Design a protein around this motif. Structure first.
Motif, short mmCIF file in Angstrom:
data_model
loop_
_atom_site.label_atom_id
_atom_site.label_comp_id
_atom_site.label_asym_id
_atom_site.label_seq_id
_atom_site.Cartn_x
_atom_site.Cartn_y
_atom_site.Cartn_z
N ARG A 88 0.85 -1.18 0.00
CA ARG A 88 0.00 0.00 0.00
C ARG A 88 0.89 1.23 0.00
O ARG A 88 2.09 1.16 -0.23
CB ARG A 88 -0.94 -0.01 1.20
N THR A 89 0.28 2.38 0.26
CA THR A 89 0.99 3.64 0.34
C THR A 89 0.85 4.21 1.74
O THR A 89 0.02 3.77 2.54
CB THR A 89 0.45 4.65 -0.68
N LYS A 134 5.26 4.71 -0.91
CA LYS A 134 4.91 3.34 -1.25
C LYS A 134 5.55 2.41 -0.23
O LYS A 134 6.74 2.11 -0.30
CB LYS A 134 5.38 3.00 -2.66
#
Ligand code: SF4
Lengths: 122, 137, 208, 82, 99, 148
Positions: free
Chosen positions: A37-38, A50
């Motif tokens: 995910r970020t 990121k």
RNA sequence: GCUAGUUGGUGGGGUAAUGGCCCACCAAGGCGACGACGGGUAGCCGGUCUGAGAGGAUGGCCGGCCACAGGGGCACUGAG
RNA sequence: GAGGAAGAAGCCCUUCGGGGUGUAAACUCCUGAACCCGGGACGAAACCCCCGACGAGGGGACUGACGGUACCGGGGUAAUAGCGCCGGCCAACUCCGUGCCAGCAGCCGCGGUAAUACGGAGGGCGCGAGCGUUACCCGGAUUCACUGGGCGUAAAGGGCGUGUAGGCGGCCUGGGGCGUCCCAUGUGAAAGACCACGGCUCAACCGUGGGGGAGCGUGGGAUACGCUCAGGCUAGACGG
RNA sequence: AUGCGCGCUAGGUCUCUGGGUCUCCUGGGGGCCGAAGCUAACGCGUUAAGCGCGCCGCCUGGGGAGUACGGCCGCAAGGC
């Protein structure tokens, strides 16, 4: 301190807590990407970091950083990690080596190409 | 009281700084030899055994530099440094191959030996070690 | 291995007419002649105040690049030079002047230390009869060095002796043009050396 | 039996041996007892074989047992020239 | 040579065995101060004649018991109970260091 | 003449109404490489003024130091406030081994073989003062022999 | 706080041989803040790296010592 | 490798002028990594046999995986360079792309429209068949301060006395000579480290020899210091 | 916001408490200003934060937290 004190007690040599507990204590430690995910770093910076959370072969499951620009990563990606924490991210104390087992080299890269795992152009 | 020797040393150092002509110390056959060393080493104008109130003392006659032009007229201290080495807390004993070259020779290092109190120049001359008293320059 | 690229620019980078080619070292077509300033896009621009590190860096880069030796071998020799006694500078120099090709070039058999390696590295010289081809070889005092007899017929070496027909050699050496031979007489002294270098700087470069 | 034998020093393809009195069951390069002479099998150096005659003469007197390749050198060193 | 030590009788409750406190000085290996480390040896008194507070010489020997490897070489001094007291004080103070 | 170096050039800032108004300070050292050294610390509203000013103080604040074959007659250690400096003679092959500040100083005294070490605070100004003071305390063998 | 073969003694068994090593009995001793016992950690060393040095870390190869030989116990033969 | 433009081209920057790339190139000459051929080992003299005498000693011959290898001769081609970085630390700077996004990062922090800090190019810098990253040790860290730190306010004086152990301890004089020093001395293996020389065409590597070398044992000496014991003193202490 | 003991190192001044030979000196405490020195500075400065020595306690970035845990003490609060 008096010499008798240094004889009674002596200087207390201080150890160092290892900053990378997950490696433990190997240089690199492979793991599988779970949560690709970020993350938005803390102030003052502003971006979409990121960050992936990977479980290590050492049993741990920690979040590492994904360098470069873009990535083929995803959940269940075999990945080798390394390195020190990105400062501007909270507790993201490991990197994801680009060029190992899932981390395709940053395409179109031209500088620092040994980092990021890119092969030299033809 | 813990160590008279450092006292007689510091009695010097204190007396040196305020530029006393001389000072006194409760005498002792051990100190008397140290004083002989400094006088024999040009570190003092000399000393002398004197009594004060039925207690023998030692009028250590200090030696000073000349009056110095500029802001500070105070003459340059002949004894720039005096520091007991072997202390009552931690004694110190020197082999021949460890009697230090104090201040590249400009200083000295008085040190007790079985051959009596001596300077480091003497000890290497006689190749003997002992308890190391104090470095001086 | 040894440096292999353009060689004029190192002088332009170093800003001093170090001698690296022979003729064009001395031609008006010397790169130091025409463009006596560092290479590259920002070459002619106003030179900034060098730092201590940069200066000392330039020194080692100055001296080291005089001989083409690797940074390692330069560094290796230093510790060996460092371990030995005396003025580490001159001691470190004589070893540098004790290299085989350096003795070759210093003996005038090559118009350039770079070319001298080719003579060494192609076995065109014998050390005291033994045809040595270690460019990093250390020639001790009182040693005899001469062209290989098969190399004697070679014309370039003739051309070098053509130059040394009347040219001289440093006081620690002794040459024979017609014999095509030379003898390393003694350790080259710091005063004997015309190295445009403050090796004292180069000492401190490894003191960090 | 405390023997006399040549241990291999030097490096690959550069043998150097120490004629040395040593207990037998030791490894051939382990702790010997008395280095009583070296040996250049390749004869590269002029004095490529220097062995103390007396000590071997001592250890032989006390019960030494030189291997054949060792006793080849002691006689070659002339310790037996009596 | 057989090791020879000189300590004080600090316990003789054991049959034919006396406890000798051996005190040894030595410089600190790092801080250079000369320090005093004591030690207790159970020398074999075959006659049980050396009594408490007696400065004696003990010597290395073949192992008499699991804890004994020394015999009293000879008496050196008696009536040194003051030393014994300082030992007795030490073991006495151990009660004050509990919880 | 004299040789000269701009050891340190800092800008200080005093606040007031309207805001911060700056001032430049400069440590400038001036020597002959022959025992003479001058520690100039001039400050002024601008770099060239202060530097020019700083060297002016150095030329008047000169101090000659007793070199000996390129080194100093003895090691020394000066406590200048928190700056604790340690200098130490060395063989002629040693060279100068110092932080940038005192190395700049000793390289203008003519010193070329010196072992040093800055302990305590490494404030370049305070470092420099301890250095110039330590040089102010050196003594040849004959000097002390004259004293005694 | 630890310790009841626990400390010692006597006698004995076992051992190439001293030894509570083991056994029977007698005594209550012994250990510990100079850190016992408990836990964690670990093969030890010459050395190696580092360091100005002091010192710190380290003990891969190599040399010496120890322990182990799927994990435990056990002896037999044997100079071992 | 040498020579080789006031400097090809391309590319990049541009003040449009030119500059950098750069003698870099191409280009000419010179050599000969490779490779081809041929020859080609040291390491191997023993055990053994004979003679002697089954000894000293002498003579004879045998044996090489490595390896047809190193190596030597002759011939012989101009024949790989990459990596990291370029704000400062720290060495090396511009343009373009992006525009708090993308991204970088070890710290300082860079990024919100002209970013020498991100990506690309050119240039350059450091190393070089290596170049970086990560892991960990030491150093820097005098930041456990024995060398070589501190405690009024930065972290640190205990709430305070008393005192246990312990640590430390006045003068003089003797004795012991414990620490202590010194000498001799054994040990302090080999290898490693150092030095000298030597062999590997040098070096790495290895060999030889020298030196050492804390520590401990052993014997002797000295007594200044501390220790111990003994005897006295009053300057500390206590007491009247 | 200054552990203790002891020694030395200008002085001036004020103050309390003793002795004397009462201008003054000699002591013991309590403040002020200040030499040298020290101190990062502030200031300390014969009542040191100077110069020394002996001994003890204590610090090793901030927070987390004098919290958790455990242990001891405590009726409890809670303390160490
Ligand atoms: S001198 Fe001429 S040839 Fe020698 S380097 Fe400088 S430029 Fe190149």
């Amino acid at each position: 301190p008096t010499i008798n004190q240094l004889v009674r007690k002596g200087r207390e040599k201080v150890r160092k807590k290892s900053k990378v507990p997950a490696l433990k204590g190997a240089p690199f430690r492979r793991g599988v990407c779970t949560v690709v995910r970020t993350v938005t770093p803390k102030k003052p910076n502003s971006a979409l970091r990121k960050v992936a959370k990977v479980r290590l072969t050492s049993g741990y499951e920690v979040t590492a950083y994904i360098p470069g620009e873009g990535h083929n990563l995803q959940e269940h990606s075999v990945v080798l990690i390394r390195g020190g924490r990105v400062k501007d991210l909270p507790g993201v104390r490991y990197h994801i080596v680009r060029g190992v087992y899932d981390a395709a080299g940053v395409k179109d890269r031209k500088k620092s190409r040994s980092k990021y795992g890119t092969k030299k152009p033809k | 009281l813990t160590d008279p020797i450092a006292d007689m040393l510091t009695r010097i150092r204190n007396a040196t700084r305020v530029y006393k002509e001389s000072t006194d110390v409760p005498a002792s056959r051990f100190k008397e030899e140290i004083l002989r060393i400094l006088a024999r080493e040009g570190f003092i104008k000399g000393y002398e055994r004197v009594d004060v109130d039925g207690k023998p003392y030692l009028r250590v006659y200090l030696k000073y530099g000349p009056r110095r032009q500029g802001p500070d007229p105070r003459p340059e201290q002949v004894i720039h440094h005096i520091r007991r080495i072997s202390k009552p807390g931690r004694r110190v004993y020197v082999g021949v191959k460890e009697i230090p070259r104090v201040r590249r020779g400009l200083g000295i290092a008085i040190l007790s030996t079985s051959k009596g109190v001596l300077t480091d120049r003497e000890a290497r001359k006689l190749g003997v070690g002992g308890e190391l008293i104090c470095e001086v320059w | 291995g040894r440096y292999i690229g353009p060689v004029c620019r190192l002088c332009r980078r170093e800003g001093v007419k170090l001698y690296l080619k022979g003729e064009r070292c001395y031609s008006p077509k010397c790169a130091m002649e025409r463009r006596p300033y560092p290479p590259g896009q920002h070459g002619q621009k106003r030179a900034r105040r060098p730092s201590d590190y940069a200066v000392r860096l330039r020194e080692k880069q100055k001296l080291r690049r005089i001989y083409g030796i690797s940074e390692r071998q330069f560094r290796n020799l230093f510790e060996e030079a460092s371990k030995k006694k005396g003025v580490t500078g001159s001691v470190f120099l004589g070893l540098l002047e004790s290299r085989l090709d350096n003795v070759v070039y210093r003996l005038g058999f090559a118009v350039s230390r770079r070319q001298a390696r080719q003579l060494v590295r192609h076995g065109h010289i014998t050390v005291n009869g033994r045809r040595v081809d270690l460019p990093s070889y250390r020639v001790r005092p009182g040693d005899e060095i001469a062209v290989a007899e098969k190399s004697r017929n070679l014309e370039l070496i003739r051309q070098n002796l053509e130059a040394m027909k009347g040219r001289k050699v440093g006081p620690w050496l002794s040459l024979d043009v017609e014999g095509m031979k030379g003898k390393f007489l003694r350790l080259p002294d710091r005063e004997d050396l015309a190295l445009p270098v403050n090796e004292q700087l180069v000492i401190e470069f490894y003191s960090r | 039996m405390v023997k006399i034998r040549l241990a291999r020093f030097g490096s690959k393809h550069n043998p150097h041996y120490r004629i040395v009195v040593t207990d037998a069951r030791r490894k051939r390069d382990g702790k010997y007892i008395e280095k009583i002479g070296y040996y250049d099998p390749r004869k590269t150096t002029p004095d490529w074989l220097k062995v103390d005659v007396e000590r071997a003469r001592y250890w032989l007197s006390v019960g030494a047992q030189p291997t054949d390749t060792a006793r080849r050198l002691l006689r070659q060193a002339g310790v037996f020239r009596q | 040579p057989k090791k020879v030590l000189t300590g004080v009788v600090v316990s003789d409750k054991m049959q034919k065995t006396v406890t000798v406190l051996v005190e040894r000085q030595f410089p600190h290996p790092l801080y250079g101060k000369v320090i005093k480390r004591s030690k207790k040896y159970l020398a074999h008194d075959p006659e049980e004649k050396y009594k408490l507070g007696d400065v004696v010489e003990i010597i290395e020997s073949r192992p008499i018991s699991k804890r004994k490897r020394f015999r009293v070489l000879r008496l050196v001094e008696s009536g040194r109970m003051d030393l014994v007291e300082k030992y007795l004080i030490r073991r006495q103070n151990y009660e004050s260091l509990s919880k | 003449d004299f040789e000269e170096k701009m050891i340190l050039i800092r800008r200080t800032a005093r606040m007031q109404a309207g805001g911060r108004r700056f001032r430049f300070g400069a440590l400038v050292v001036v020597g002959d490489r022959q025992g003479r050294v001058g520690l100039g610390f001039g400050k002024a509203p601008e770099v060239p003024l202060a530097v020019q000013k700083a060297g002016y103080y150095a030329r008047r604040n000169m101090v000659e130091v007793p070199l000996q074959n390129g080194t100093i007659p003895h090691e020394i250690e000066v406590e200048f406030g928190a700056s604790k400096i340690v200098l130490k003679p060395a063989a002629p092959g040693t060279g100068v081994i110092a932080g940038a500040v005192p190395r700049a100083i000793l390289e203008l005294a003519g010193v070329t073989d010196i072992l040093t070490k800055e302990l305590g605070s490494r404030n370049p100004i305070n470092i420099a003062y301890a250095t110039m003071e330590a040089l102010r305390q050196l003594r040849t063998k004959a000097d002390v022999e004259r004293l005694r």
